[PDB]
Nucleic acid binder design. Structure first.
Ligand SMILES: [Mg+2]
Ligand SMILES: [Mg+2]
Ligand SMILES: [Mg+2]
Ligand SMILES: [Mg+2]
Ligand SMILES: [Mg+2]
Ligand SMILES: [Mg+2]
Ligand SMILES: [Mg+2]
Ligand SMILES: [Mg+2]
Ligand SMILES: [Mg+2]
Ligand SMILES: [Mg+2]
Ligand SMILES: [Mg+2]
Ligand SMILES: [Mg+2]
Ligand SMILES: [Mg+2]
Ligand SMILES: [Mg+2]
Ligand SMILES: [Mg+2]
Ligand SMILES: [Mg+2]
Ligand SMILES: [Mg+2]
Ligand SMILES: [Mg+2]
Ligand SMILES: [Mg+2]
Ligand SMILES: [Mg+2]
Ligand SMILES: [Mg+2]
Ligand SMILES: [Mg+2]
Ligand SMILES: [Mg+2]
Ligand SMILES: [Mg+2]
Lengths: 129, 156, 205, 82, 80, 123
RNA sequence: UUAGCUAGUAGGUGGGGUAACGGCUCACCUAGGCGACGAUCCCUAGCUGGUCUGAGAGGAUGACCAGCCACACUGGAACU
RNA sequence: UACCCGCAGAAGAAGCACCGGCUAACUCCGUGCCAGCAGCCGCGGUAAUACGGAGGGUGCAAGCGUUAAUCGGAAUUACUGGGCGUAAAGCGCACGCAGGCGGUUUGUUAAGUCAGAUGUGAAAUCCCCGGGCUCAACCUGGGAACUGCAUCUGAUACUGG
């Protein structure tokens, strides 16, 4: 069954990049929106857009640099079978700081670097590199 | 100039009607003391001919590696066919902590400070391919900055 | 607990000069410095990576005259201390008292400097020090004591120290037969043929 | 009874005494309640060879702790130096 | 302010005594998975006022019996 | 491999048996020679390996190879085994210590003398 | 390749008892209680701070020093 | 007693393992599938760098080796960090209780989670910066650490209710 939408989101991104797809659509959510907000801000996708009213469809415009893909690697960390929570000291550095770790905190979803500057940790959603 | 190291020689065979025909293989790696590295695999009836064919192919098919000062930039992994390979940037003067063929390829790569580990099969051909693939797909802060469309300082 | 055999056999094995003799007579006169010792000395076999790491570590040991357990403990200390391990390892070898005596030229060899230490001829900051491996902190004075100040071999060693290059990190006064360990030396002050990374890779299996 | 006393924690021929608060039925180097300082009899010049938390010592004495003969000597020597 | 716990009532057959399943929610020390762990306690109740499947809130007191050192404070979700 | 499966049934290790069980985690055991004899080895080799059947102190009766050239071993001789198997012999898992309690050192051996219990030959 | 165990057993009332709560004990009443989150049975074993190893997580271990427990020919008992 | 001073004179003071590959280090003479070596691969049948001696050399050094034992290497029980078409490995298939997991929205809770504070986590030990024995070992001051637990105060994205 569809037990996990966030890994479905990441997988549709990953396969879109490998297929050289321009845009990727999926059923929207409040969290999938907050993550695409982060991925646009950090520069991995160009733009996101949610359309529709009763069942909204989130469309992501992917980003390609020099022909090849921007998102080299994207991985799910916390899963329904195994949740991962970290403190602010034990936040990870993806690719020695080059990649990011999308973290859900009490003050919303942010990157790991802003979580450290905020002085608070949370749930590690994904490693994006 | 381009420092050249042979990693391993090996005697192979080929059975015919008369009997066994022996031959020699040579695995060489070249490098400029910087990110320009390249390997070769030659084979002949004789060992100096095999090293010469290997150095010939290695001097071409070089690959460029975005180094840091003397080390890597982020912990990278490389696979080829039997050999998952982990390597990690290290502090100054900790040395090349690496196994077998990876020491030679990083020495001619001009790296000097790594913490490496070769899991799986340690066949030198595949592990040197796995290191070449790991260093080749290791990316700089400039390349990720131009890619994400931000500055290096916005990447930190 | 010391090597007491032939010294040029060691320099012949390492292939280069180790300054194990005073340098009055030329080493190419005293020995075949280009030929390894023994019956099978002429042959130069294809030396392995473990061979070059061993020969480099045995070079540095045979230079300074340090046995293996103690050289291992210097590696442990250099890895514990911050910064470059090989540079701290050489700074610890250069901090030995018998090296400071050699570098000040009070003894012709490091062994003769060792013998002066063991034979109570050295005062450190006024206090007599009998130990070859005493570490010499910066801003420390080191002197010949009164009775052995009139030795012949001391001012002969100062002559040969004048033939040798003067080290920067020291400040010697050859009249008083004293000196001053001003600071720990930089890597650039030392020799460049020593590949300290081979030792780190050796003790980092 | 509860007492305040030394505890030999040194090398051979070179003692060093932790001044501790202990129930007197325990061993010398054994169980204690609170370590209120030290004393070094082979103390060089330009080092402390005596350091006593006199506020805690007067706290335990207000609780009724006894004082050894050497501890009371070291309290005298502290209250004469200072 | 006093420390208290909650849980379902497992059994109520013995008089002035009920058995309560407190279900704590702990992490595994190795694999990181969060595992529900169940704790059964014999709880003193006056008046035999609780039933099966009932949620209850208990506090720790002096030992009433051999296996019983807990007394409820109040009852939530009384009915079936 | 599922973490739930590992919760319910953990990763069990391999209890490694000892190839010298008669020593009982001791380095050497005193034994008494029951029968001294020779044995032909496996097929690629060909020799007469000198080996003794020993009643030990702990009660076991094991066979033990006798190294070196020549031995004064008899029955009712008191030896000291040390562990270490001979590959080219089936069932021999132990080596006798040459130079211990009845066994003599090797006659006129001047290299590896400590592995055979031989004093330093004075000049 | 140990799945069922338990009748002072589980709880209640009252009496006794201890420095003190309490089946601790006794009478009576009730019929419970534990157990697949491993009861019971079997083998082994003093526990910890820690030590060794290991990049780490982990693995092994518990000599010396220090904290707790237990025992003092064996099995029991009480006195002060 | 440490410690110091004086005397005399190189006197009174170096061995052990190894040298086929792994593994740093080679030649000769005996020897002949014998004697024997051996951690593994394997050596030995008349030219043995692999046995035994010698010369030479290498590694350690008042120690050197062997044996036993633990971890490591071993990602070879894999949490980190493995696999299951043919190499070991998908139950013959299915329903299904317990159990594990769970679409989307709003509100609430605050259990999990996160942050902070307080108490505790004995000392020693490990680590850092120092101090003292001629140095070191050792001894020692201070600190960090003991990744834990409890309570309280908050936070509410996520998970749960
Ligand atoms: Mg393999
Ligand atoms: Mg020594
Ligand atoms: Mg260091
Ligand atoms: Mg009563
Ligand atoms: Mg009663
Ligand atoms: Mg026992
Ligand atoms: Mg490991
Ligand atoms: Mg008794
Ligand atoms: Mg070699
Ligand atoms: Mg021959
Ligand atoms: Mg050999
Ligand atoms: Mg293992
Ligand atoms: Mg393992
Ligand atoms: Mg496998
Ligand atoms: Mg088959
Ligand atoms: Mg099969
Ligand atoms: Mg099937
Ligand atoms: Mg949900
Ligand atoms: Mg909470
Ligand atoms: Mg908290
Ligand atoms: Mg502590
Ligand atoms: Mg000091
Ligand atoms: Mg909710
Ligand atoms: Mg909620």
């Amino acid at each position: 069954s569809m037990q996990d939408p966030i890994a479905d989101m990441l997988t549709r991104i990953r396969n879109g990049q490998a297929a050289n797809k321009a845009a990727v659509t999926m059923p929207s959510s409040k969290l999938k929106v907050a993550i695409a907000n982060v991925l646009k801000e950090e520069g991995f996708i160009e733009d996101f857009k949610v359309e529709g009213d009763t069942k909204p469809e989130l469309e992501l415009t992917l980003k390609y640099f020099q022909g090849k893909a921007v998102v080299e690697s994207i991985q799910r960390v916390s899963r329904p079978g195994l949740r991962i929570y970290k403190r602010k000291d034990e936040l990870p550095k993806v690719m020695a700081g080059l990649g990011i770790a999308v973290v859900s905190t009490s003050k919303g979803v942010m990157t790991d670097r802003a979580a450290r500057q905020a002085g608070l940790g949370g749930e590690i959603i994904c490693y994006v590199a | 100039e381009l420092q050249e190291k042979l990693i391993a020689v090996n005697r192979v065979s080929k059975t015919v009607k008369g009997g066994r025909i022996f031959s020699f293989t040579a695995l060489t790696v070249v490098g400029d003391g910087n990110g320009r590295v390249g390997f070769g695999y030659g084979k002949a009836r004789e060992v100096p001919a095999a090293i010469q064919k290997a150095m010939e192919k290695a001097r071409r098919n070089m690959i460029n590696v975005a180094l840091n000062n003397g080390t890597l930039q982020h912990p990278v992994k490389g696979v080829h066919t039997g050999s998952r390979v982990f390597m990690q940037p290290a502090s100054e003067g900790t040395g090349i902590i690496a196994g077998g063929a990876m020491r030679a390829v990083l020495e001619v790569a001009g790296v000097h400070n790594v913490l490496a580990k070769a899991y799986g099969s340690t066949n030198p051909i595949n592990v040197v391919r796995a290191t070449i693939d790991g260093l080749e797909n290791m990316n700089s802060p400039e390349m990720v900055a131009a890619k994400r469309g931000k500055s290096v300082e916005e990447i930190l | 607990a010391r090597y007491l055999g032939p010294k040029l056999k060691l320099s012949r094995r390492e292939g280069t000069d180790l300054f194990l003799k005073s340098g009055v007579r030329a080493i190419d006169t005293k020995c075949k410095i280009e030929q390894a010792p023994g019956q099978h000395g002429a042959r130069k076999p294809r030396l392995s990576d473990y061979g070059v790491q061993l020969r480099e570590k045995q070079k540095v040991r045979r230079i300074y005259g340090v046995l293996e357990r103690q050289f291992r403990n210097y590696y442990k200390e250099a890895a514990r201390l911050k910064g470059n391990t090989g540079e701290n390892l050489l700074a610890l070898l250069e901090g030995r008292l018998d090296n400071v005596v050699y570098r000040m030229g009070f003894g012709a060899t490091r062994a003769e400097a060792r013998q002066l230490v063991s034979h109570k001829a050295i005062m450190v900051n006024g206090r007599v020090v009998n130990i070859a491996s005493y570490q010499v902190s910066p801003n420390d004075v080191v002197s010949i004591r009164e009775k052995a100040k009139k030795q012949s071999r001391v001012k002969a060693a100062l002559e040969l120290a004048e033939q040798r290059e003067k080290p920067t990190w020291l400040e010697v006064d050859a009249g008083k037969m004293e000196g001053t360990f001003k600071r720990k030396p930089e890597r650039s002050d030392l020799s460049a043929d020593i590949n300290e990374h081979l030792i780190v890779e050796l003790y980092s299996k | 009874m509860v007492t305040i006393r030394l505890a030999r924690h040194g090398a051979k021929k070179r003692p060093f005494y932790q001044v501790v608060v202990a129930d007197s039925r325990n061993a010398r180097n054994g169980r204690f309640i609170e370590r209120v300082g030290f004393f070094n009899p082979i103390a060089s010049e330009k080092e402390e060879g005596t350091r006593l938390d006199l506020d805690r010592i007067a706290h335990w004495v207000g609780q009724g702790a006894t004082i050894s003969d050497r501890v009371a000597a070291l309290i005298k020597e502290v209250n004469k130096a200072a | 302010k006093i420390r208290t716990l909650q849980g379902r009532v497992v059994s109520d057959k013995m008089e002035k005594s009920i058995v309560v399943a407190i279900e704590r929610f702990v992490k595994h020390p190795i694999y990181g998975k969060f595992i529900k762990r169940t704790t059964k306690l014999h709880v003193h109740d006056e008046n035999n006022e609780c039933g099966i499947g009932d949620v209850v809130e208990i506090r720790e007191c002096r030992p009433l019996s051999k296996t019983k050192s807990w007394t409820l404070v109040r009852v939530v979700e009384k009915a079936v | 491999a599922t973490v739930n499966q590992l919760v319910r049934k953990p990763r069990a290790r391999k209890v490694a048996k000892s190839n010298v069980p008669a020593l009982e985690a001791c380095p050497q055991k005193r034994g008494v020679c029951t029968r001294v004899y020779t044995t032909t080895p496996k097929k690629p080799n060909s020799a007469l390996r000198k080996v003794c059947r020993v009643r030990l102190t702990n009660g076991f009766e094991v066979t033990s190879y006798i190294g070196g050239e020549g031995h004064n071993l008899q029955e009712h001789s008191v030896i000291l085994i040390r562990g270490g198997r001979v590959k080219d012999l089936p069932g021999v898992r132990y080596h006798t210590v040459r130079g211990a309690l009845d066994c003599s050192g090797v006659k006129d051996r001047k290299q590896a003398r400590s592995k055979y219990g031989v004093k330093r030959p004075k000049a």
